[PDB]
Amino acid sequence: IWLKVCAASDMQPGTIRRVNRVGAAPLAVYRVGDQFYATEDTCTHGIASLSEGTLDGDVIECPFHGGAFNVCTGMPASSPCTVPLGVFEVEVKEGEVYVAGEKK
Amino acid sequence: IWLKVCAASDMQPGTIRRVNRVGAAPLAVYRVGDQFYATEDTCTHGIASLSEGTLDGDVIECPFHGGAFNVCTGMPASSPCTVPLGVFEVEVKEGEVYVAGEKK
Amino acid sequence: QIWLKVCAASDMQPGTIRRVNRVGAAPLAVYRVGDQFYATEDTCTHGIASLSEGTLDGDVIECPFHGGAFNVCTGMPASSPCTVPLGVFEVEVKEGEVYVAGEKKLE
Amino acid sequence: MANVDEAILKRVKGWAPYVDAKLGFRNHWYPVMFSKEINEGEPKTLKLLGENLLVNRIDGKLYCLKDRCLHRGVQLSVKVECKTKSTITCWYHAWTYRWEDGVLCDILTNPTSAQIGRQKLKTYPVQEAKGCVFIYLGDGDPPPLARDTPPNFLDDDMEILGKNQIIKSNWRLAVENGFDPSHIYIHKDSILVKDNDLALPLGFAPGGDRKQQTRVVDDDVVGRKGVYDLIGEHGVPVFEGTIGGEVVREGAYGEKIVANDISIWLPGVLKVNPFPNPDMMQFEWYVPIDENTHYYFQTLGKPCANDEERKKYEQEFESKWKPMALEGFNNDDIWAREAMVDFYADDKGWVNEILFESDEAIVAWRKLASEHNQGIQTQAHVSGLEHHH
Amino acid sequence: MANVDEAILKRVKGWAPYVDAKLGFRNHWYPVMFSKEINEGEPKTLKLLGENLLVNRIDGKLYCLKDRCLHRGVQLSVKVECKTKSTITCWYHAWTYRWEDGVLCDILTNPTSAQIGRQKLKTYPVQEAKGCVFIYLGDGDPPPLARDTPPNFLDDDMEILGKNQIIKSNWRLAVENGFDPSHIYIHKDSILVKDNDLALPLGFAPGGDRKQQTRVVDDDVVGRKGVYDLIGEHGVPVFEGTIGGEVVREGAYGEKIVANDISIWLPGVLKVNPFPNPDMMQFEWYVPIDENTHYYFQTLGKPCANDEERKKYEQEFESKWKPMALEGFNNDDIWAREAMVDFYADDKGWVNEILFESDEAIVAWRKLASEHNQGIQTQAHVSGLEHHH
Amino acid sequence: MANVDEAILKRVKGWAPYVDAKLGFRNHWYPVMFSKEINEGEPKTLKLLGENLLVNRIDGKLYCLKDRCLHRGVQLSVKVECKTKSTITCWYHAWTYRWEDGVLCDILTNPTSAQIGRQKLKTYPVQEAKGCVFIYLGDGDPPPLARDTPPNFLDDDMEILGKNQIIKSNWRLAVENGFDPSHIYIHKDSILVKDNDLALPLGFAPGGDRKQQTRVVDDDVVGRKGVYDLIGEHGVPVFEGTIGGEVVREGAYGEKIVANDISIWLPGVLKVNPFPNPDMMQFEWYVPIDENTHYYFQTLGKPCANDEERKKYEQEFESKWKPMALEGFNNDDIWAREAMVDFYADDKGWVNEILFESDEAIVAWRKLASEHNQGIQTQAHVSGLEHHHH
Ligand code: FES
Ligand code: FES
Ligand code: FES
Ligand code: FES
Ligand code: FES
Ligand code: FES
Ligand SMILES: [Fe+2]
Ligand SMILES: [Fe+2]
Ligand SMILES: [Fe+2]
């Protein structure tokens, strides 16, 4: 079920970490300030890795075409993205980052 | 000769008032500050009603194409207008506005 | 002919240009940048314009024809469309008198 | 949204949205061809509101997909590959889409692609009515077709026959010319006038107030939006054209009275009744193809009680009405539209035009269109909507 | 009047108005056709300084109206309707104008319209001289034609003959080529050289100072403004062209001396004297049609005391001068002008050109034109002047 | 720079330089014609990177001068006047330049002009190799030609034959199509497949990670920069194309194995090996002419040890390879390129394209090109570089 991703301190504020999942699409864990969010890593508009994009507040900018999503709702924030990103609730307990097993 | 338009008090400065006449073309009355003026209501560049336009100082702008005239002289102030507007005499006798039946 | 008598250092105000015509030779342009004097060919290398009719901005002269420009000290282009360096002529002041070289400097 | 210089749009306060609508109004139904022009399993291409489209008939039903692959943007139609009854495969990298919903259901060049089932090619609703193919060039659930058609066009007993072609002028020039009360002057020498003994004035001397010159319909039982030209209600028909007092031209004194009522409706279809004969009606659309061209989709309707009358009507249409009216009368409208192209090409004609009385009809249409259109088609809709957070 | 990038105009400080005059100079007379090309009651179309015009001959006199109806901006010429001798009726809604003053005197589609007698279609003065039709493309009462013609063109005894055609290049490129002292090199193989035994150098080695290279005329009592090319007064003509000191080309050593008196005059007409023969003169205009084209109005003059000489001159013009000179000599000027189009098309050529000595003549012309033109034609003059506040 | 709207360039942070290079990359060698097409004293005109050029052969050697007179900017080629063996004289006012260094050495219309010997017309290095004419459209001393050529093109025994033509599409669309792993689908019906018994899949099911899909070359000793398409090293080739799980098309099961070694190199040349036959190689350039067109410079190489062998190859080339491969196989690439024109013409396609896995190869190329190109050709290079005194 829940996936133990990393220690909260393993990520500096404003950074993104790609989480590979054997037999499944990779995820992207974002650290916005002292909060953590997670979505599918692959941009819904192509093959770009959002973990290699630019984080502006709660909005992740795709490195390929400048499309963007709100990492909290997964909804597109900038064109050309039109397909909502899969979102995974995140929980931080005892300084450890956990991400829901399935989109939700 | 003269026609009863309205009470000088009924018109706030910077406003326009259309004066419909029986068996004749409509006129437009403008209150610029504390002075009143009158001209043909129909824009000389087309069939627009200047009373539906915008008054800026002593210049009336036609709603159709943005042409304009000086309400005091009736002379064109902005393109595409080129034909001077007909000006009519106004009189404020005892807090009451009157417009001349014919153009001065 | 080594040194050509131009004028008195006094006859020129800072930031001005003077044309020096020469018998059987192309005209020169003498520029006063502050209290220093410099000189180059007067004809713009980009065409037939007279640089002495241009505008001096510091140590850079702007041609009146197309807006090209040169650094008056080095003669190197400062603004397009100019691309060919100007010939530079040494200038010296002796006894308050301005003299310009009759031959341009070489490498 | 933003198709014309902002300085020009600021000047035409009476109808800025209309002037901006160079490419037409989005979210409306538009006729583009006749049902008989598209057969089972034979995809057809066309351009509507600047968008390249593909229409196919599968099991008798029509489907419409945007003719542009999601991958590298090529037109699928360059080399059509319909490998299964319900799909179309791009000739480039084999991305395959379902005609029914446009879903990217397969990719022959990479069956394991993560894109499969995760993308959708734009689809548009298509409906056939009266032998005509209508496409809803819009987003979301479409409104009833009746909203975008003139009254009676969809009447059960109304038999519709027509002709369609591409004309080189912006759609608005076509609409305005058709609804123009005084343009009747260009038809003074039409063969229809003489051959069908029509009464046809040269123009009209308006009567009454400007409000009485037109009748705007803001809502029908089906949400229709349009304007009726009532210049003839209190106006005086002009049958003798004079210059300096001398008669230089005369209208036509035929006995057949036609065009008692003329109305224009969004998205841009004119209804002339009765025309070209007292027992018929004419409905014609000026469909935006791009900023410089439109489909001139002409139709003539006549109530027919049985197959017998429909047969006779069809014969009369082909032998007389199509050549004498649709062509013999309306051909003059075609070059008239083309004649206004230059003046409005730089968008400056919308400011410099000098209108006169009968243009109250055109002004009413411009305002109605500006206030009730369902959306302005932009170049961005064509290339891909843009938005930056 | 902003026809070119401001950054470029800022760079060409010596002649910015000229560089900005891409559409030509307004308020000057321009020849557009020959008298024999416009017949009584047969209106003719043409474009001058970007404006579409119509010329008509009524009772032998010429009249010019702008070919654009005030109403919806269509060209009246699409379907000419001159219903009375003194008027023209627009084919669209019948707005009728008087040829003599452009006043909207009638409207057949609505004889009660308030526009009648209140609007006026733009008119332009027209004058015929020497069998040539000149139009004053300007506003207000026109100056005398002589102001915009070269000296002697209007001489009583001067018989004028010529030809006109449309050339694909901006008018300025044609003017500069014509007044270009060194371009004579492109004529070294002209049939006129051998066939008319002319003396013709390949170029000129200039002599004297800058001022001596030309004679700027700004004191002409008639108001004429122009420049004389005086490169040959102090220069040594080149008859032996060399490369590496080796002669590779020779000029023409014929006995006929020609083209020793060349001058250019606003608005853009060249005078070559004597040419193509020692007893003749050539006057040619480069009239702006639009930013990419001009009329190459060629005329040859020869004093004639009577009909006998006029017939003889006419015969030689047709059999020799026109084919051997106007075409045999000037044809090379046509493609030479076209060859410069690309370099100046983006306005960059006005900055990047690398001039040499003989171009002093062209520079003098650019300055004269910049300082003495009567106005800069703008696209707004074409669509409709614009002004706010 | 300044070729594309800045708003668009800001969006494609991964390869902005490449998207901006609509006119191609300056300071690289480019083939423009075959040696046999330019004869002694027979100047030829051509446009490369938007610039009009003139090429001539003098005493066997090739020289290249910009086809635009310094004076009034006309093309010297409108009326060529080569009055002496080492010079060309403008037909307008006779400014004369030396083919060897472009120096304005004489002016027939004014032998006393001060411009003489003080102006220089732009010249570009020209080199002939393998029967191909290469022009270095750049400034300063040129690098070795080998830097801008694919490996083996210059091998001693490699006999090169080819065909060249002008195609109506931007050069980048041609490059991407050529290096596009999955575009192989458009060639499924080529006469070359059946007529030369080729094994040709319909596509590929990628395997492994991103890094493994290609091999970026930036360590080559000659300085060449390029990318190898390794999609087939972990990917399973597709021979059965399915829709809804049902087979609707199959690939080719021929015996000859080809094109399992594909690489793209700056400035824009593809190498397919072996192709179109197991004992041959194909090297093709997509040379920028202007923003809308390119030269499709095709060459086929085959090792030959002597005149007898290279002659046999030439005959096979004319009777089979040219019509069956260069045309029979690549003609489909031509219209495929043209098909992408509209989408990218407004520069919006660079933002709106929806890529899938195999495009990993194209992305790698876009990144390599953006990082290792030697300069962006701009419209200013064409009209005249501009600079304002700061
Ligand atoms: S791949 Fe992310 S915006 Fe296109
Ligand atoms: S109708 Fe008033 S500006 Fe045109
Ligand atoms: S002549 Fe000086 S910049 Fe051109
Ligand atoms: S462009 Fe259609 S599958 Fe690639
Ligand atoms: S456009 Fe001429 S009368 Fe209407
Ligand atoms: S344009 Fe070449 S010498 Fe003048
Ligand atoms: Fe009509
Ligand atoms: Fe000439
Ligand atoms: Fe291919």
Automatic annotation (TrEMBL), chain F:
Fe(3+) binds at residues 183, 187, 333. Keywords: 2Fe-2S, Iron, Iron-sulfur, Metal-binding, Oxidoreductase. GO terms for molecular function: 2 iron, 2 sulfur cluster binding; metal ion binding; oxidoreductase activity. Mg(2+) 3 binds at residue 253. Gene3D superfamilies: 2.20.25.10, 2.20.25.680, Naphthalene 1,2-dioxygenase Alpha Subunit, Chain A, domain 1. InterPro entries: Cholesterol_7-desaturase, Homotrim_ring_OHase_catalytic, Rieske_2Fe-2S, Rieske_2Fe-2S_sf. It holds the Pfam family Rieske. [2Fe-2S] cluster binds at residues 69, 71-72, 90, 93, 95. Fe(2+) binds at residues 183, 187, 333. The keyword Cell cycle does not apply. Residues 29-135 form the Rieske domain. Mg(2+) 2 binds at residues 197, 253. Mg(2+) 1 binds at residue 100. PANTHER family: BLR4922 PROTEIN (PTHR21266:SF59), IRON-SULFUR DOMAIN CONTAINING PROTEIN (PTHR21266). This is Terminal oxygenase component of carbazole.
